[PDB]
Structures are given as C-alpha cells and as structure tokens.
Design an enzyme around this catalytic site. Structure first.
Site, PDB file in Angstrom:
ATOM      1  N   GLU A   1     -34.967  -1.737  -3.424  1.00  0.00           N
ATOM      2  CA  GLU A   1     -35.941  -0.972  -4.166  1.00  0.00           C
ATOM      3  C   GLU A   1     -35.890   0.466  -3.716  1.00  0.00           C
ATOM      4  O   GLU A   1     -36.863   1.091  -3.329  1.00  0.00           O
ATOM      5  CB  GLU A   1     -37.359  -1.502  -4.145  1.00  0.00           C
ATOM      6  CG  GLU A   1     -37.448  -3.035  -4.364  1.00  0.00           C
ATOM      7  CD  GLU A   1     -38.873  -3.575  -4.508  1.00  0.00           C
ATOM      8  OE1 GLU A   1     -39.842  -2.781  -4.398  1.00  0.00           O
ATOM      9  OE2 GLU A   1     -39.010  -4.850  -4.593  1.00  0.00           O
TER      10      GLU A   1
ATOM     11  N   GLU B   1     -42.106  -9.407   0.987  1.00  0.00           N
ATOM     12  CA  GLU B   1     -43.110  -8.775   1.847  1.00  0.00           C
ATOM     13  C   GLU B   1     -43.887  -9.727   2.766  1.00  0.00           C
ATOM     14  O   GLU B   1     -45.087  -9.627   2.966  1.00  0.00           O
ATOM     15  CB  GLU B   1     -44.029  -7.893   0.984  1.00  0.00           C
ATOM     16  CG  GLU B   1     -43.277  -6.734   0.338  1.00  0.00           C
ATOM     17  CD  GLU B   1     -44.139  -5.889  -0.604  1.00  0.00           C
ATOM     18  OE1 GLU B   1     -45.391  -6.115  -0.709  1.00  0.00           O
ATOM     19  OE2 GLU B   1     -43.526  -5.042  -1.286  1.00  0.00           O
TER      20      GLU B   1
END
Ligand SMILES: [Ca+2]
Length: 306
Positions: free
Chosen positions: A233, A117
């Site tokens: 994910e 991220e």
C-alpha cells in the site's frame, strides 16, 4: 502504452476502484480492490452477498491478465455490523461461510490477504465496522496470536491452492515492530500457515526522521524467514511536486531493489486515492503526470532486476 513494470522481474501494481480505473492497465500490472473485498462491503446485510464491486475488480484483472490480491478476509474496520452481537459460535460459522464463499467465487486469486493489521487494528472493537469477533477465532489464546492462527488455518482449508499473506503497517520503520511481527510469522510457520509477508509502506511509515538504512535492515530481517516480501500500500505525499519527487528518489529504490521483495502495489495514483488531502496522487486532476511519475517510469525501466 505498456505498464511501467512490463519488463521487470517483479510487478508494480496499484489499488483499483472507480477513481483509479482510467488508464489503469497502461501503467500497472497487478491490482488490489480498494474496498469491495472487505467483508462489510460484501455482506452488509446478513446472508446476502453483494459481489458487484469485487466482481468488477476481479473481472478487470482477469481481462488484463494481471495478478489479483484479495483484500481482505479478516480486519478490524469495515466488517459487517450485524456480527458484533452474535455469540462466538455463530460468529465463527459466519466467518467460515465468508471464507468458503470467496474461495468458491474467485478460484484464480494470486495472493490471499488473510489478516491485515494484527499489530494495529485487530477485530476486537464494537464500534462502526469493528466486527467484534476476536473471540470467535480463539482470542489471544496461549500464544498471544490464536485468532491470527485460526484465520490462517481457515484459509488453508478453504483455499488449498492459494498463496496466503499477512499484512501490516509501521513494521520496517522500527526494529522493535519488526521483531513483534516476526513473532506472529514464527507462530504461523510452526504450522506452515503463511506464504508471504506484506508491509504497507504508506507515507506516514517512510518519513525522513527514520533513515532508510533502518527500513533496509528490517527488510533483511523479514527476508531471513525465507518468505517473499510484498510492499502492499505504497504512497508518498506531494504537498509540492518537488517534495514528492525527492521522497520517491529517497524511498522507492530501497524497496524496489531489495532481492526479497517480489512486488510493490501503489495505494492509488489518481485523485480520490486514500491520501488525497496530502496530494499523494501521481497524476493531477487535469490528467497530467507529476515529476515523481516521470521519474518512476524511467527508474523502473532502468531497474528490471534478476
Ligand atoms: Ca453469512
């Protein structure tokens, strides 16, 4: 039963932890530890390493001969609390010692998620689990992404035989986000620092107001780097069985059939996964399979690739 992707050209894996364990190897053929490999999980107290949950994931992966993704070296949540008030030079020594500890203990990591991220959750906050160590990695620096370069440099040094991956969300939903992420990739590739590109693809990234053609175009752009892509994910909400099924049919094939995608990892499949409130699980509390999973089994068997 054999896992869904037993005969496919790419793996179909899942997040692993206590609620995801029942039957896990009867469905999935790759894993990521959900939480135990975050640095705040292992080193909540300075200089004492609690490897219990991470060792559980790794030992299960090894017993089942399935690839292990280490999640995650550097991130902006779930970092140790005590590091936030150390001076940058000491924080850096702690980061280097963490990277050396993981490489010593876990020699058979298939994919090392070095930074997660970078566009969304850098380790620049001093809130609970924020880490506050951006400066220990050079901060933004000259290129704007110095701390990402330094994380990967440390990974190359400590893991000289391991595939290194970057990971993020909300990438393929926007050309502009894709072009931002590719600038980080470009910088890393100047020093040959990264081997794989991850994109999460949670439910909030794949809603129908962005057409699937947008996602497919941005996958093609990521693939033009020459690097393998991994969907890391993946989840789809299930307020009703029918919404979940319709969304799996719409979204899953765009990623599964892309030639540069080398594996998908679901972000759980049983209750207790991250998106539990949104009912993203594929098996109900009573142990029965939902229509999306019935479909997914058959779809994957019909789409082995290569
Ligand atoms: Ca330490």
């Amino acid at each position: 039963a054999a896992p869904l992707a037993a005969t496919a050209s790419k793996f179909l894996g899942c997040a692993y932890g206590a609620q995801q364990a029942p039957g896990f190897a009867q469905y999935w053929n790759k894993l990521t530890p959900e939480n135990g490999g975050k640095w705040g999980s292992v080193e909540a107290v300075r200089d004492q390493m609690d490897w219990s949950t991470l060792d559980a994931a790794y030992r299960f992966a090894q017993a089942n001969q399935m690839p292990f993704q280490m999640h995650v070296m550097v991130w902006g949540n779930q970092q140790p609390e005590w590091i936030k008030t150390l001076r940058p030079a000491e924080q850096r020594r702690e980061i280097e010692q963490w990277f050396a500890a993981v490489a010593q203990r876990y020699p058979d990591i298939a994919l090392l998620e070095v930074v997660n991220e970078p566009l969304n959750d850098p380790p620049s906050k001093a809130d609970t689990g924020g880490g506050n160590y951006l400066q220990a990695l050079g901060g933004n620096g000259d290129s704007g992404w110095e701390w990402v370069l330094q994380s990967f440099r440390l990974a190359r040094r400590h893991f000289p035989h391991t595939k290194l991956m970057i990971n993020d969300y909300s990438i393929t939903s926007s050309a502009q986000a894709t072009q931002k992420y590719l600038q980080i990739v470009r910088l890393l590739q100047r020093e040959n620092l990264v081997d794989a590109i991850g994109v999460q693809e949670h439910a909030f990234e794949t809603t129908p107001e962005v057409a699937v053609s947008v996602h497919r175009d941005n996958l093609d752009a990521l693939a033009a780097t020459g690097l393998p892509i991994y969907i890391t994910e993946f989840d789809l909400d299930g307020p009703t069985d029918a919404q979940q099924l319709a969304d799996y049919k719409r979204v899953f094939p765009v990623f599964w059939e892309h030639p540069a995608v080398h594996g998908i990892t679901l972000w759980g499949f049983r209750p207790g996964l991250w998106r539990d409130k949104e009912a993203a699980y594929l098996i109900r509390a009573d142990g029965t399979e939902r229509p999306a999973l019935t479909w997914l089994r058959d779809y994957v068997a019909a789409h082995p690739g290569t």
